[PDB]
Design an enzyme around this catalytic site. Structure first.
Site, short mmCIF file in Angstrom:
data_model
loop_
_atom_site.label_atom_id
_atom_site.label_comp_id
_atom_site.label_asym_id
_atom_site.label_seq_id
_atom_site.Cartn_x
_atom_site.Cartn_y
_atom_site.Cartn_z
N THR A 1 86.80 61.18 9.77
CA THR A 1 85.71 60.92 8.78
C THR A 1 84.88 59.71 9.21
OG1 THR A 1 86.86 61.90 6.88
CG2 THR A 1 85.19 60.24 6.38
N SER A 2 83.57 59.83 9.04
CA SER A 2 82.64 58.74 9.27
C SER A 2 81.70 58.66 8.08
CB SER A 2 81.83 58.97 10.55
OG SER A 2 82.69 59.03 11.68
N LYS A 42 81.06 65.04 1.53
CA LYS A 42 81.82 63.82 1.25
C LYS A 42 81.04 62.83 0.39
CE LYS A 42 84.22 64.39 5.63
NZ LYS A 42 84.67 63.75 6.90
#
Ligand SMILES: [Mg+2]
Ligand SMILES: [Mg+2]
Ligand SMILES: [Mg+2]
Ligand SMILES: [Mg+2]
Ligand SMILES: [Mg+2]
Ligand SMILES: [Mg+2]
Lengths: 233, 226, 196, 211, 204, 125, 195, 222, 195, 196
Positions: free
Chosen positions: C1-2, C33
Site C-alpha cells: 500500500t502507498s 483506499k
C-alpha cells in the site's frame, strides 16, 4: 540450507506443432522490493535449447556459468561440436537434474525451479521441469511458481493433451503465452511488465525476443469502483 | 472449492463447483455451495463449510425479520454489513469466505467477504483454492457491458478452470442468475462434465454370503393398545 | 500500500494506489483506499483491511451522530475519534490511517495516526509499505501553498515511485480533492504514471 | 506386534503374530516376523522391520562365515553377541530392534533377547511387541519345563491368540516354529479369525465374546 | 491424543429401493487396548436412526441429548420427528458448540413416513450436512469405507441385496482398521418393519 | 431509576377474578370486528380498516399480518399492542424453531409461543 | 492409587484395589483404601490424579446418600453409574477436569443381579463382566478372557483374582503393596481381611 | 528451514496371478493442490522381465529406479549375462534402500514379474528396505481405499458359500489376466472418485513368459 | 538395573545388586546378575543406561584380564579403580558418553585389606566403608550410618544388608525383584545363593 | 549505513556516511566505509563490519597477487573475486558490497553484490539501511554522463536524505572520485549537507 535472497518469479512454457515456447519476466526481487529490472532469466544454450530459471538469482548466475562451461567442455577434442555431437536439450536437462538432486542430497540446494525448453536432433519437442528438490516432470505445458497456478490453466485450454500439440500453431501458442504473461502481471505482486520470450522451432531455429512489454491492459473499469461496500461517492 | 461472481448488463451471476473435501478425500461429490440469503440475494462460500452455511442462515434469518419489520425487500448492502460485522467480531475464527451477489430496489450488486471481516467491490470476483485458475479465465475474457448469456458462459468457464486444474475443486457447475425486475433463477447442476464411466464388473453378492449370528425385529412403533 | 495526503492553497488532496495483496497474490488490483467518513473529511487506510474498514465505519457512524446533534465536525474532531479507537484498542488492531479534511475556517488539514494510535498534525503525510521509498523524494519536492495542479503532479510523481519500487503497491492511482468548490475524484492509469 | 519364544524340555517354541499397521490403517495382514537365519537359528522381529531383516540377514552371513572358518557350528551365545555388537555401532542413531535369537547348540536349547540398545539377555521365556503383556499372562500361568512338544506348540499359539484378541495392533495369523538339535521345524500359518472361534468352542474360553 | 481416534469405530449408511440400511462395528477401545465388544453406535428415536462414531463419551452424551430433544419434540408436535427435520436438529445442536465441539461423526438414516422417501445424511463434528443420495461413511476407517462403498454400491438395491452390500462394505473396511471390528450390527429399514442382524467376523 | 415494579400488577380478587385480564377483554370488546373462517382447502381472515382520518393513508396500516409464509394473523382491540406482538411472533418463529429445525413452525406451536408471551404479561412484574 | 480391578461373578461383584500411596520418591502409605460405599449395595473404587480421586468419590457419595434420604429408596447400580458418568462428562469440559477413573460394583436388589460398570475420566461408561483401569488390564485381561465364566462362585472369582494379582506382581515394575478386596452381594458390602 | 522431501501423490497396484503379474499406476503427478503433469510415467520396465515402481517422493523414486536399472546392467557385466531373478532383484533393492537408512528414499517400492518356476510374483518394500513377497499390494495415496476391496474380491475375505451360513468359505479360485485387469480398473475408477490426487490416466504393465506388455486407460481429469 | 549397594567389613567386601530388567512397561527378567569379575579378588557391580552398562563392564573386564596375562600379576583394587575412573572421565567428554555407575569391591592381597570404591559415570571416585548409586543411598545410608562398625564380621555385614534391602522393599516405589549378593575376601569371590 | 556509487562522464564516484552502530549506540561516528582494494578499484561496505573488512582484505591480497603476475586487473575481475567470496560463503556472511573502479579502456564501472552473492552491473547503485529512503529520489534525479560537479551534488543530496531519515546513518559524507586524473578524496560536514 539457506534462504533465497534476490529472486525471480514465474517461468512459463508450452509445446506447439513444430517446437516449444518459453517466457519469463525481467525482474529480480529483494523481498517486496522490486530491486533489479534488467535481469535476463532465459539463458540460451547453443541454437536448440533455452533454459528458463526462477528462484534465487545468485544460484541462477551459478547455473548460467555451469552451462557456459558445459559448452566449452563439449567442444574439447570434438570435431563434430557444431553438428552430430552438439549439446542436446536432453543432455543439458539431465546434467542440471543430476546437479539439482545431488545438491539437495547434501542439504545444500540450488534454490531454483528450472524449465529446459528445446528441440532435439530428430525434430522432437523437448520440455521438462526440475527444481531445488530434484523433482522432475514433463507436460505439454509447464510453469513455475505463480505461473503454475494461473498460466497452466490458460495454456492447457490450448493444449489439453498430447494430441492437441500438432493442431497448435506458433501464432496461437505465442498469443496464449503473451496473454498468460499479462494475467501474471495483473495478479502476481512480484512480477514486472517487461519480459523475454524465446521460440525454438525445428524449421526456423531459435528466435530470442528481448524487451517485450505487457500491452492491451484493462484498467478503465476501475473508475466506477468506489468504497468497499456502502460508499457511493 | 472454486466460486466466482460476474456482473452483467441488467444483473449479476454467481457460480460454484460441487466438490467438498476432508483432506485429500472427497466427502461429497455433489455439494451445494450456492446458498440463499433471501429470494434475490444469494451467496457462495469457501473455507470452513459449516461456517459458510451457518453465517448465511443466521444473516438470512435476520434479513428476513428486517424485511418484515421495514416492509421493504432486503438489500445486498444490508447482508454485507451484517455479515462483515459478525465475522469481524469473531476475529477470523469463523472461517467463512463469501461472494455475495443480488438484486434489490437500489440495483444489482456484487461483493466479496473475508473471514476477518474485510469486504471488496468488483465486476468480477473469485474465491477458494481454485480462485487463481478461475481469475486467470476472468482476467482473459471479461469485458464491460456483458450480456446475460455471456456472463453465464464466462462464470461457468471460470469454474471449469478450477474443476480441471485445482485438486480442491471438481464434479459439477452450479449457477444462479439474478436479473433486475425478475425472479432469481437457481440452476443446480448447470453443467455435468464428470459422470463416472460404467464399471467393468457388477459387485452384487449372492444372498447368504455374509455370516449372521442373530436376527431380531426392532420395535420402532409406540406402546400398543389392549 | 502507498497512501498520502497533501495540504495546498485551496485545501487538501488525498492519494492512494489500488493494490491489495494476500502474500504475493494480488487479491484486488482496483481497490478504493480513499474512504469517506464525512462530506469533506476523508481518510487513507493502511494495515489490516478488516481493521481499517471496521474503524472507518465506526467513525462514519460517530460523525453522522455528531452532525445530527452539533452540526459539521472539524477535521481535528474526526482525527480524535480515529485516535480514540486506535489507541484504546492498540493490542488488537493493525491500522495506519491518514485523516484529511476541509473546513472553511481551518481550510485543508492532514493528520496521521500510526500503529500506536498517536496523532500528528502535518502539512503532508505519507504511509503504507511503499512510503519508505519516497521519504527522500517527498521531503525534497514538497512546498507549502502549492496550486491544485502542482499538488496533483506532486502526488502523482510520488506514488508513481512508491509503486515502482514496492511490490505491495500498484494498479491505478486514485485521488480525492477537498476544497470549498466541493469533492472531486481523480484516477490515473499505469500508461500515464509509469512514463513519468 | 506380538512375538514370543520359550525354552522347554525338547527345545524352544517360537510364536509370532503377523500384523503390520501404519497408524490405524492395517498395511499388512501377513508379514513374516520370524527370520530363518539358518537351518539351526531363528530370529523374531519387533520394532523396525527393516532393521530386523537387514541385521539378522547379515547375522546369517557372519554365522556361515564362522562355520566355514572354524569347521563347526556357531553357538547361540556367540550368534546373539555378534548381533548385539552390530547394534552398539549405531547406538543412539535410531535403530529399532527387539528380537529373540533361538537355537540349539552344545549347551542344549538356547534363547537370547537382543535389542537396539545392545542389551543381550539369556533366559527361559521372552515376549516383545505391543501385545507382549497379554502373552505373558498365558505363558506364566501354564508354563512348565515338563511340557510335551504338542502342548508347548499349543501354549505359544494360544498366547499369541490372547494378544491378537486384546491388542489392536496384533493379529492376522499365527506362525509356529519348533527348534530341535537337528534344526527348526515349521508348524504352519494359522489364521486368527478361524483360530479364535475354534479355540473358543473347544476350550470354552472367551465366554464374553458372542459366537 | 486425537479425540476422534482414541476409542475407534465406524458407521456406514446406504439407500436402496424403498429402504435404507445403517451399520456399525461393536468395538470400544483405549487406543491399543480393546475394552468392549458390545458398544453399539446406532440409536433410534421413533423411526429415525442415528449412528455416531468418534469419542465414546460424546457418543453417549449426544444419544442422551437427542433422546431428550426428540421426546420433547414429540410431546409438543404430537408426532414423531422425521429424518429431514432431525438432520437439521443434529446440525443445529453440533454448531452451537462451534468453539468447543463434540468430537463425533454422526450419521442419520430413515424413511419419511408421509412421502415414503429413503433418506440418509452425514455430518462433520461441527454440523456441516452431507446429504448424499448413495451412501454415507464415518469413523476411523472412513477411507476404507469410501473405497468399499464406491465400488460395491449400485442404486435401487432390494432390502436383502442391500444387506449383503452394506455388510461386506463394513466387514472388509473394519478388517483393514486396527481400531474397528470386534463384532458388527446391520439395520435393514423399511417403511413399517426394521430388521437387526449381528454379523460373525474375526475377533482381532 | 431501575424498574422497581418487580411485583405482579395482575392479582386475584376475593371472588377469584383476575381484574386486569377481564379489563383487557373489555378493551377487546370495544375493538373493531375481525373474523376467521376455515374451509376444506383454505382459511380466510378478515377485518374492517377503520380509518381514523380520511387524510390518513390506511394502506400503510396493516391489520392483517404475515407471521410466516404459511401463517397469518388479525386482531381486535389495541392496535399498538398487536403490532409489537407481531414483531415478537415473527422473531420467535425463527429463534425458537427455524434456527433449530430448519423449517417454519406449525400453526399450533407458533400460537403456543404467542400465547406464552401474553400469559407472561399477565404474571410478570 | 493406580491399580483397580473388578469382576462380576454369579451372585456378586468383587473389587480389588491397591494399597500404595506415593509422594515423590517415597511410599507414604501401604494400607490405603481406594473405595467409597455409595449405598448399602453399591461400592465405587477409584484411581487417578492425587486429591481429585477422594474429592470426587466423596462428592458422589454425598449426592447418593442425599438421594437415599430424600426418597427413602436405594437407586439401582445402573442409575448410580449414569449419574456418575454425567458428572465426569460434565467435568471433562470444565476449566479444570477431575482426573478420576472409577469402577462401580453393585448388586441390583430388584433384578437380583450383580453389576459392574467401568467409567473413565472422560465419562466413557461400559458394563462388563470384568474390568480395569490404566495399564492394569494389559496384564490381567488375557487371564480373565481365558478363565472367566458367568456362573462362577464368589470363591472361584477370588481365586481368579489372586492369579491376576500374582501376574501383576510378577510383570509390573511398580510395587503397589498388594490389594484390598471387597465383595458386593445381596447382603451388602464386606471386606476380605486375608488376601 | 530446507525440507529435502516432498509428496508427488500417485497410487500404484501390484497383483500376482498364477502365471502372470501386473503392476499398475496412475499417471498424475502433483504438489499440494496443483497438477504438475497428467501423464508422467511411474511404472517402468527395468529389463530381465522385471517391472518396478517407487511411489511417493518422485525425486527419490526416479533415483532408486535409475540405480536399480543400473544394478541390472552391472549384474550382467559381472556374472556372464545371467538373468536377474525376481527374488535376487528384491534382495538387491533392500540393500539399495537400507544403504540410506538414516536419510531414506521417501518411497514405497513395488516390483513385479515371474519367479524361477514361472509363477507370478510381486514384492513390496517400505522406505528403509524391509520387504516381502505378496499376492496383492496397493501403494501410495489411495492404498487404504483399494486394499480392503482387493481383500474382498481377490481373496474372497468375509465371503461364505450361500446356504451354509458362515460354515464354508468361498473357495479361492484362480483369476485370469482379463479378470485381474477388470479389478485393477475398477479399483482406480473408485479411487479417482474419492481421492483428489488420483486421476488423469491409468497405465498397466503386464508381465508374462512372453515379455512385458502395456495398457493405458483414461481416468477422470477433475 | 538401578540398585547396587556395597559394604566393606573387617575381612571382606559385600556387593548387593538388584535382579530386575525392565523393557517398557514389562519386567523381562528377575534373575539378572549386574556384576563382572575383573580379577580373582576384584568384583565390579554396575548400574545405568541399558546396553552401556554391560558393554562398559565387559570392556573393563577384558582390559584387566589382558593386564593379568601380560604381567602374570593381579592389579591391586586401587589400581583397577583408578583405571576405571580414568575410562569414565575420558568417556564423559566423548561424543556419546557411557552412562554407567559402578561399585568396585576388591580384597588387596598385599595389604590384607578389603576395599570398596564408588565411581559414578562422570568419573567421580571415592573410597568408602559402604556405598550406593542413584536413590539407593537415600533409603539405606541412615541405617548404615547407625549400625556400621569397621570390625564387623561377614555375617553381621549380611544382616545389616538384609535390613537395608527390607527398608528399600518397604519405601521404594519400584519393584526391583530382590538382590544377588556376592562376597569378596582373601579366598576370592563367592555368591550367597540364599538371600 | 548509507552507501552509493555513481558512474559519470569522466569516471565514477563512491559515496558513504560515517556512522557505525551497536544497537542505538554510535560506536564510531567518523568511520571510513570507502575501501581501497586496488589503485583505482574501491568498494563501499555494508552489513557485518567484521565480514566486509575480512572480505576486502582478502580481495586486496588477490588483486595484489594478480597485478604482480598479469598486470592491472579490470573492475569486472575485482567484482568477480568479491562475488566468489560472498557466494561460496553465503551461509556464514552478512555482506552487501558495491564495487566501483576506473579503467582507461572501460572507463567508470559500478557493480553491486547484495546478500546472496549475486552480481549486477549498473550505471549507479545504492545500498545499506538508509538506501531504502532514497530509491525514489535517486531514480528521479540520476542522469547518465553527468559532470564531476553534478555527480558530487547528486551523491551529496542523496546521502543527505538517507542520513536525515535513517538513524543507522549519519556523521560526515565521505566521497572518493575515480578518474584518469587520479584519486581524489572529498569530505562534507553536517553543517553543509543538512541545510540542503
Ligand atoms: Mg558383530
Ligand atoms: Mg487385534
Ligand atoms: Mg479438480
Ligand atoms: Mg561416586
Ligand atoms: Mg560472522
Ligand atoms: Mg541519521
Amino acid at each position: 540450507t539457506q534462504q533465497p535472497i534476490v529472486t525471480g518469479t514465474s517461468v512459463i512454457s508450452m509445446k506447439y506443432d513444430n517446437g516449444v515456447i518459453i517466457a519469463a519476466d525481467n525482474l529480480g526481487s529483494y523481498g517486496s522490493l522490486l530491486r533489479f529490472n534488467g535481469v535476463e532469466r532465459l539463458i540460451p544454450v547453443g541454437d536448440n535449447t533455452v533454459v528458463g530459471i526462477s528462484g534465487d538469482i545468485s544460484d541462477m548466475q551459478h547455473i548460467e556459468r555451469l552451462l557456459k562451461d558445459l559448452v566449452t567442455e563439449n567442444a574439447y577434442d570434438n570435431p563434430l561440436a557444431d553438428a552430430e555431437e552438439a549439446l542436446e536439450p536432453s543432455y543439458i536437462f539431465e546434467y542440471l537434474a543430476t546437479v539439482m538432486y545431488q545438491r539437495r542430497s547434501k542439504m545444500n540446494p540450488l534454490w531454483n525451479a528450472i524449465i529446459v525448453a528445446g528441440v532435439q536432433s530428430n525434430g522432437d519437442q523437448f520440455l521438462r521441469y526440475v527444481n531445488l528438490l530434484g523433482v522432475t516432470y514433463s507436460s505439454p505445458t509447464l510453469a513455475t511458481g505463480f505461473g503454475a497456478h494461473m498460466a497452466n490453466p490458460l495454456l492447457r485450454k490450448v493444449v489439453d493433451r498430447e494430441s492437441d500439440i500438432p493442431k497448435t500453431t506458433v501464432q496461437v501458442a505465442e498469443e496464449a503465452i503473451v496473454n498468460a504473461m499479462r494475467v501474471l502481471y495483473y495478479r502476481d505482486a512480484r512480477s514486472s511488465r517487461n519480459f523475454s520470450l524465446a521460440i525454438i522451432d525445428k524449421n526456423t531455429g531459435l528466435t530470442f525476443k528481448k524487451n517485450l512489454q505487457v500491452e492491451n491492459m484493462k484498467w478503465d473499469f476501475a473508475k466506477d469502483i468506489k468504497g468497499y461496500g456502502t460508499q457511493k461517492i | 472449492t472454486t466460486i466466482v461472481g460476474v456482473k452483467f448488463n441488467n444483473g449479476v451471476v454467481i457460480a460454484a463447483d460441487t466438490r467438498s473435501t476432508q483432506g485429500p478425500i472427497v466427502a461429497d461429490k455433489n455439494c451445494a455451495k450456492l446458498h440463499r440469503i433471501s429470494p434475490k440475494i444469494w451467496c457462495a462460500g469457501a473455507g470452513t463449510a459449516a461456517d459458510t452455511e451457518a453465517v448465511t442462515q443466521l444473516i438470512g434469518s435476520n434479513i428476513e425479520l428486517h424485511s418484515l419489520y421495514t416492509s421493504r425487500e432486503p438489500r445486498v448492502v444490508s447482508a454485507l454489513q451484517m455479515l462483515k460485522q459478525h465475522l469481524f467480531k469473531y476475529q477470523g475464527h469463523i472461517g467463512a469466505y463469501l461472494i455475495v451477489a443480488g438484486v434489490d430496489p437500489t440495483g444489482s450488486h456484487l461483493f466479496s467477504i473475508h473471514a476477518h471481516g474485510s469486504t471488496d467491490v468488483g465486476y468480477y470476483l473469485s474465491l477458494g483454492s481454485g480462485s487463481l485458475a478461475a481469475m486467470a479465465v476472468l482476467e482473459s475474457h471479461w469485458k464491460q457491458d456483458l450480456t446475460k448469456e455471456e456472463a453465464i458462459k464466462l462464470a461457468s468457464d471460470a469454474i471449469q478452470a478450477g474443476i480441471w486444474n485445482d485438486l480442491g475443486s471438481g464434479s459439477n457447475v452450479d449457477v444462479c442468475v439474478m436479473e433486475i425486475g425478475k425472479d432469481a433463477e437457481y440452476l443446480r447442476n448447470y453443467l455435468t462434465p464428470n459422470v463416472r464411466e460404467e464399471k467393468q464388473k457388477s459387485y452384487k453378492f449372492p444372498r447368504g454370503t455374509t455370516a449372521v449370528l442373530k436376527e431380531s425385529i426392532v420395535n420402532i412403533c409406540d406402546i400398543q393398545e389392549e | 500500500t502507498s497512501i498520502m495526503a497533501v495540504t495546498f492553497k485551496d485545501g487538501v488532496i488525498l492519494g492512494a494506489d489500488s493494490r491489495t495483496t494476500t502474500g504475493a497474490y494480488i487479491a484486488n488490483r482496483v481497490t478504493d483506499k480513499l474512504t469517506r467518513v464525512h462530506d469533506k473529511i476523508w481518510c487513507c487506510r493502511s494495515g489490516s483491511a478488516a481493521d481499517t474498514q471496521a474503524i472507518a465505519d465506526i467513525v462514519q457512524y460517530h460523525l453522522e451522530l455528531y452532525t445530527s446533534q452539533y452540526g459539521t465536525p472539524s477535521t481535528e474532531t474526526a482525527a480524535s475519534v480515529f485516535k480514540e479507537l486506535c489507541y484504546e484498542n492498540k493490542d488488537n488492531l493493525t491500522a495506519g490511517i491518514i485523516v484529511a479534511g476541509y473546513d472553511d475556517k481551518n481550510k485543508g488539514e492532514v493528520y496521521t495516526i500510526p500503529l500506536g494510535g498517536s496523532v500528528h498534525k502535518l502539512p503532508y503525510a505519507i504511509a503504507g509499505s511503499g512510503s519508505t521509498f519516497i521519504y527522500g523524494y517527498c521531503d525534497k519536492n514538497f512546498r507549502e501553498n502549492m496550486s491544485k495542479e502542482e499538488t496533483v503532479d506532486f502526488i502523482k510523481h510520488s506514488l508513481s515511485q512508491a509503486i515502482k519500487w514496492d511490490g505491495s503497491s500498484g494498479g491505478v492511482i486514485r485521488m480525492v480533492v477537498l476544497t470549498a468548490a466541493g469533492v472531486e475524484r481523480l484516477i490515473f492509469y499505469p500508461d500515464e504514471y509509469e512514463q513519468l | 506386534t506380538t512375538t514370543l519364544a520359550f525354552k522347554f524340555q525338547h527345545g524352544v517354541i517360537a510364536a509370532v503374530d503377523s500384523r503390520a499397521s501404519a497408524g490405524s490403517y492395517i498395511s499388512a495382514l501377513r508379514v513374516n516376523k520370524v527370520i530363518e537365519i539358518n537351518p539351526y537359528l531363528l530370529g523374531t522381529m519387533s520394532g523396525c522391520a527393516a532393521d530386523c531383516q537387514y541385521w539378522e540377514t547379515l547375522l546369517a552371513k557372519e554365522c556361515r562365515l564362522y562355520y566355514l572358518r572354524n569347521g563347526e557350528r556357531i553357538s547361540v551365545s556367540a550368534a546373539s553377541k555378534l548381533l548385539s555388537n552390530m547394534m552398539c555401532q549405531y547406538r543412539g542413531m535410531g535403530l529399532s530392534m527387539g528380537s529373540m535369537i533361538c537355537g540349539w547348540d552344545k549347551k542344549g536349547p538356547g534363547l537370547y533377547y537382543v535389542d537396539e540398545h545392545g542389551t543381550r539377555l539369556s533366559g527361559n521365556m521372552f515376549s516383545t511387541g505391543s501385545g507382549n503383556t497379554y502373552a505373558y499372562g498365558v505363558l506364566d500361568s501354564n508354563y512348565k519345563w515338563d511340557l510335551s512338544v504338542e502342548d508347548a506348540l499349543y501354549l505359544g499359539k494360544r498366547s499369541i491368540l490372547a494378544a491378537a484378541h486384546r491388542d489392536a495392533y496384533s493379529g492376522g495369523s499365527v506362525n509356529l516354529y519348533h527348534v530341535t538339535e537337528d534344526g527348526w521345524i515349521y508348524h504352519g500359518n494359522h489364521d486368527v479369525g478361524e483360530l479364535f472361534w475354534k479355540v473358543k468352542e473347544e476350550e470354552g474360553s472367551f465366554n464374553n465374546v458372542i459366537g | 491424543s486425537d479425540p476422534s481416534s482414541i476409542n475407534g469405530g465406524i458407521v456406514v449408511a446406504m439407500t436402496g429401493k424403498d429402504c435404507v440400511a445403517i451399520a456399525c462395528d461393536l468395538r470400544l477401545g483405549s487406543q491399543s487396548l480393546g475394552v468392549s465388544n458390545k458398544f453399539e453406535k446406532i440409536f433410534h428415536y421413533g423411526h429415525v436412526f442415528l449412528g455416531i462414531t468418534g469419542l465414546a463419551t460424546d457418543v453417549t452424551t449426544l444419544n442422551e441429548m437427542f433422546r431428550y430433544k426428540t421426546n420433547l419434540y414429540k410431546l409438543k408436535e404430537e408426532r414423531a420427528i422425521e429424518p429431514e427435520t432431525f438432520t437439521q436438529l443434529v446440525s443445529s445442536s453440533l454448531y452451537e458448540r462451534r468453539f468447543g465441539p463434540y468430537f463425533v461423526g454422526p450419521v442419520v438414516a430413515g424413511i419419511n413416513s408421509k412421502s415414503g422417501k429413503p433418506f440418509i445424511a452425514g455430518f462433520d463434528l461441527i454440523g456441516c450436512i452431507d446429504e448424499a443420495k448413495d451412501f454415507i461413511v464415518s469413523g476411523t476407517a472412513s477411507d476404507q469405507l469410501f473405497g468399499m462403498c464406491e465400488s460395491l454400491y449400485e442404486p435401487n438395491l432390494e432390502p436383502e441385496d442391500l444387506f449383503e452390500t452394506i455388510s461386506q462394505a463394513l466387514l472388509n473396511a473394519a478388517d483393514r482398521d486396527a481400531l474397528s471390528g470386534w463384532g458388527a450390527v446391520v439395520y435393514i429399514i423399511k417403511k413399517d418393519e426394521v430388521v437387526k442382524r449381528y454379523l460373525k467376523m474375526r475377533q482381532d | 431509576m431501575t424498574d422497581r415494579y418487580s411485583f405482579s400488577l395482575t392479582t386475584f380478587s376475593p371472588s377469584g377474578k383476575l381484574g386486569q385480564i377481564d379489563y383487557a377483554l373489555t378493551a377487546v370488546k370495544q375493538g373493531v370486528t375481525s373474523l376467521g373462517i376455515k374451509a376444506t382447502n383454505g382459511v380466510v381472515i378478515a377485518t374492517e380498516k377503520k380509518s381514523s382520518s380520511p387524510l390518513a393513508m390506511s394502506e400503510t396500516l396493516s391489520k392483517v399480518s404475515l407471521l410466516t409464509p404459511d401463517i397469518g394473523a388479525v386482531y381486535s382491540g389495541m392496535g399498538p399492542d398487536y403490532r409489537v406482538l407481531v414483531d415478537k411472533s415473527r422473531k420467535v418463529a425463527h429463534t425458537s424453531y427455524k434456527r433449530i429445525y430448519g423449517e417454519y413452525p406449525p400453526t399450533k406451536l407458533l400460537v403456543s409461543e404467542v400465547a406464552k408471551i401474553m400469559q407472561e404479561a399477565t404474571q410478570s412484574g | 492409587m493406580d491399580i483397580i480391578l473388578g469382576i462380576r461373578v454369579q451372585d456378586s461383584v468383587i473389587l480389588a484395589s491397591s494399597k500404595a500411596v506415593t509422594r515423590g520418591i517415597s511410599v507414604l502409605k501401604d494400607s490405603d483404601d481406594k473405595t467409597r460405599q455409595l449405598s448399602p449395595h453399591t461400592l465405587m473404587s477409584f484411581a487417578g490424579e492425587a486429591g481429585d480421586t477422594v474429592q470426587f468419590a466423596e462428592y458422589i457419595q454425598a449426592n447418593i446418600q442425599l438421594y437415599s434420604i430424600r426418597e427413602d429408596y436405594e437407586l439401582s447400580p445402573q442409575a448410580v453409574s449414569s449419574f456418575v458418568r454425567q458428572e465426569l462428562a460434565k467435568s471433562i469440559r470444565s476449566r479444570r477436569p477431575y482426573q478420576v477413573n472409577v469402577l462401580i460394583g453393585g448388586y441390583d436388589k430388584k433384578k437380583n443381579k450383580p453389576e459392574l460398570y467401568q467409567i473413565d475420566y472422560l465419562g466413557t461408561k461400559v458394563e462388563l463382566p470384568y474390568g480395569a483401569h490404566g495399564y492394569s488390564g494389559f496384564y490381567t485381561f488375557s487371564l480373565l478372557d481365558h478363565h472367566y465364566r458367568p456362573d462362577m462362585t464368589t470363591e472361584e472369582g477370588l481365586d481368579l483374582l489372586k492369579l491376576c494379582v500374582q501376574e501383576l506382581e510378577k510383570r509390573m515394575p511398580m510395587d503397589f503393596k498388594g490389594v484390598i478386596v471387597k465383595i458386593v452381594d445381596k447382603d451388602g458390602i464386606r471386606q476380605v481381611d486375608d488376601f | 528451514q530446507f525440507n529435502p522431501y516432498g509428496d508427488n501423490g500417485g497410487t500404484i497396484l501390484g497383483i500376482a496371478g498364477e502365471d502372470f503379474a501386473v503392476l499398475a499406476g496412475d499417471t498424475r503427478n502433483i504438489t499440494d493442490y496443483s497438477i504438475n503433469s497428467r501423464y508422467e510415467p511411474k511404472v517402468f520396465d527395468c529389463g530381465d522381465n522385471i517391472v518396478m515402481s517407487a511411489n511417493g517422493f518422485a525425486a527419490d523414486g526416479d533415483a532408486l529406479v535409475k540405480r536399480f536399472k543400473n544394478s541390472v546392467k552391472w549384474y550382467h557385466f559381472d556374472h556372464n549375462d545371467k538373468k536377474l531373478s525376481i527374488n535376487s532383484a528384491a534382495r538387491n533393492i533392500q540393500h539399495l534402500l537400507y544403504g540410506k537408512r538414516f536419510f531414506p528414499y521417501y518411497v514405497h517400492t513395488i516390483i513385479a514379474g515371474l519367479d524361477e518356476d514361472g509363477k507370478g510374483a510381486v514384492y513390496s518394500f517400505d522406505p528403509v528396505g524391509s520387504y516381502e513377497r505378496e499376492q496383492c499390494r496397493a501403494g501410495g495415496a489411495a492404498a487404504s481405499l483399494i486394499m480392503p476391496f482387493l481383500d474382498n474380491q481377490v481373496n474372497f475375505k468375509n465371503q461364505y458359500e450361500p446356504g451354509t451360513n458362515g460354515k464354508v468359505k468361498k473357495p479361492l479360485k484362480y483369476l485370469s489376466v482379463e479378470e485381474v485387469i477388470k479389478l485393477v480398473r475398477d479399483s482406480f475408477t473408485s479411487a479417482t472418485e474419492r481421492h483428489i490426487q488420483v486421476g488423469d490416466g491409468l497405465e498397466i504393465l503386464i508381465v508374462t513368459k512372453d515379455g512385458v506388455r502395456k495398457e493405458f486407460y483414461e481416468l477422470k481429469r477433475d
